Amino acid sequence: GLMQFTLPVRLCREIELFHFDIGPFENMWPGIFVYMVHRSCGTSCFELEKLCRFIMSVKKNYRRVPYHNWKHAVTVAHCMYAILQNNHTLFTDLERKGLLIACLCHDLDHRGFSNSYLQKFDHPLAALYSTSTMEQHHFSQTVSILQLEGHNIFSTLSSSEYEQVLEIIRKAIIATDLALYFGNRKQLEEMYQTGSLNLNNQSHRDRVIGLMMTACDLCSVTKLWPVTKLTANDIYAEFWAEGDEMKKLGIQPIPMMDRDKKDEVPQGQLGFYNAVAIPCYTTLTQILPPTEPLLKACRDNLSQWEKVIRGEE
Ligand SMILES: O=c1ccn(-c2cccc(OC(F)(F)F)c2)nc1-c1nc(Cl)[nH]c1-c1ccccc1
Ligand SMILES: [Mg+2]
Ligand SMILES: [Zn+2]
């Protein structure tokens, strides 16, 4: 109860900032997450014994893949923590509880492959879930873990609060399916421009929470250049492995995933910053002004990629 977590001074300060890197020391990541929960939600919202046991089972169910791993999970939860802490009064208690856990769990048991590769492989998960394949699996994995004995961190919520939070989590996780992001942002842009946007309309919150999830999920593009540059290696390591697996199936992969076309990465990064990242953080800044540092950091990194193409690095 009276056991707060404390971080070293640099971390205590730097953790509040959007561009914080969680560092290479795996064994501090759990404490960093509990620190975030306690500050964001209260020392009360979860029973510590049950939380710490939830965290470790979650960790155990992330795989040793280059990018969609445990570190990603915690990094994504941290970005949401920065958003929640910079928009204090906009969010309900259950929402703050749900979203941090949602982020930690959002890529559970990811194997390193896109929904497309599963479908083309004819993986069983593709039969069980025709759209948002991995994402429906991530949420399923989340509920399974919540149902382990001693793992229900929501135990002291009322029945309705319980269905409310599991619904927040389900929508949040599904929303990290980037195929759904484009339409979701288009609608939020339309609604913000025409002035219809209304945070008391539950379905409008849902969309806004979806955009936040896209923002946290992509937050590697909002780090300092050296963090962003090095994370890009891990991302492409999965992409090329998948490209290899496509070719194994007799399918020529898209250039993004072809390790022969490694030369074209810098250009592919621009496409991505322009088509996805920049619009995402733009619309998020309009809806939630204090998240601007994410837009600024992303723009700075777009420009660092432009310097790469131009042979200046
Ligand atoms: O660096 C990247 C270059 C390309 N793509 C990408 C991923 C799907 C599709 C697509 O094409 C289309 F533009 F059509 F969407 C591009 N994504 C990233 C990326 N960066 C961060 Cl941080 N997270 C991702 C990411 C990881 C897994 C999955 C998705 C994104
Ligand atoms: Mg995912
Ligand atoms: Zn993710």
Side-chain angles (χ1 to χ4, degrees):
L2 291 171
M3 281 189 193
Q4 287 304 252
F5 277 49
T6 50
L7 302 170
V9 176
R10 188 197 59 86
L11 281 81
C12 180
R13 294 186 205 178
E14 254 100 327
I15 195 168
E16 296 306 314
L17 308 174
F18 282 101
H19 62 266
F20 183 63
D21 182 79
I22 64 177
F25 304 101
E26 283 220 328
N27 293 142
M28 293 176 69
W29 300 339
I32 288 170
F33 185 75
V34 174
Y35 180 80
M36 287 189 299
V37 170
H38 288 170
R39 255 193 132 255
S40 203
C41 191
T43 91
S44 56
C45 64
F46 297 122
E47 217 268 291
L48 201 54
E49 199 186 273
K50 284 188 166 232
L51 190 58
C52 286
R53 206 160 31 216
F54 183 77
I55 287 165
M56 299 308 285
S57 286
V58 174
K59 165 178 162 79
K60 189 219 290 149
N61 280 278
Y62 277 93
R63 299 183 175 264
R64 289 203 190 85
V65 288
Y67 178 64
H68 293 99
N69 57 38
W70 175 231
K71 197 180 191 177
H72 168 72
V74 180
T75 302
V76 166
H78 162 274
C79 187
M80 175 72 63
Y81 166 85
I83 299 188
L84 291 167
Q85 291 293 263
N86 281 259
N87 299 266
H88 181 57
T89 71
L90 274 88
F91 293 102
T92 68
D93 290 347
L94 273 182
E95 276 169 351
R96 296 209 250 80
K97 277 183 213 216
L99 291 171
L100 280 174
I101 294 298
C103 290
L104 194 70
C105 291
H106 85 282
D107 269 331
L108 266 170
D109 190 48
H110 201 283
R111 334 287 176 119
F113 297 116
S114 66
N115 292 336
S116 286
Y117 175 76
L118 292 206
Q119 290 165 26
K120 276 157 193 150
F121 183 82
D122 207 356
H123 186 291
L125 294 164
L128 184 53
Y129 318 110
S130 34
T131 65
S132 306
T133 306
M134 287 301 307
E135 291 82 20
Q136 293 202 71
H137 182 57
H138 299 317
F139 176 64
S140 173
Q141 287 280 284
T142 307
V143 173
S144 293
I145 292 191
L146 268 177
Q147 275 164 181
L148 269 9
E149 256 206 355
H151 291 58
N152 203 304
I153 57 163
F154 299 117
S155 51
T156 79
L157 272 31
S158 56
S159 176
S160 58
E161 281 187 291
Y162 187 95
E163 158 138 38
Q164 273 177 45
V165 81
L166 258 283
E167 191 67 20
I168 287 156
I169 291 164
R170 187 195 57 83
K171 286 174 203 153
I173 286 178
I174 295 306
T176 58
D177 176 1
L178 204 64
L180 301 172
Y181 146 77
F182 300 102
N184 186 48
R185 187 209 65 88
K186 289 166 207 157
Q187 288 282 154
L188 273 167
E189 191 75 356
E190 287 178 15
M191 289 172 188
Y192 166 82
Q193 284 167 359
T194 71
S196 34
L197 188 67
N198 173 10
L199 297 173
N200 307 310
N201 190 305
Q202 179 61 58
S203 84
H204 283 181
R205 288 181 95 67
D206 283 357
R207 295 196 167 287
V208 170
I209 296 163
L211 191 66
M212 291 162 62
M213 291 298 299
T214 307
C216 298
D217 203 14
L218 301 189
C219 77
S220 279
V221 305
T222 78
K223 304 296 178 190
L224 299 177
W225 171 238
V227 179
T228 296
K229 184 179 154 197
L230 294 166
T231 305
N233 291 343
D234 298 329
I235 288 160
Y236 281 89
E238 296 198 0
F239 283 170
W240 298 329
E242 180 174 324
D244 288 351
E245 294 299 323
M246 291 288 200
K247 293 175 208 191
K248 285 188 191 178
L249 294 176
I251 298 168
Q252 256 289 129
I254 64 185
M256 198 192 307
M257 295 181 171
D258 192 348
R259 67 171 82 250
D260 294 339
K261 297 179 194 178
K262 195 180 272 83
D263 43 285
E264 314 183 14
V265 163
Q267 199 70 68
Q269 285 295 286
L270 292 191
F272 183 80
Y273 277 69
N274 290 318
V276 181
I278 287 298
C280 167
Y281 295 117
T282 301
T283 312
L284 181 71
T285 302
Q286 291 165 180
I287 296 175
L288 289 178
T291 65
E292 194 184 23
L294 296 161
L295 176 54
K296 166 188 185 302
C298 183
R299 286 196 173 290
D300 274 334
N301 279 318
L302 174 47
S303 146
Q304 283 296 295
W305 283 111
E306 278 159 349
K307 290 178 173 159
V308 171
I309 296 148
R310 297 197 297 260
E312 304 174 49
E313 41 163 17

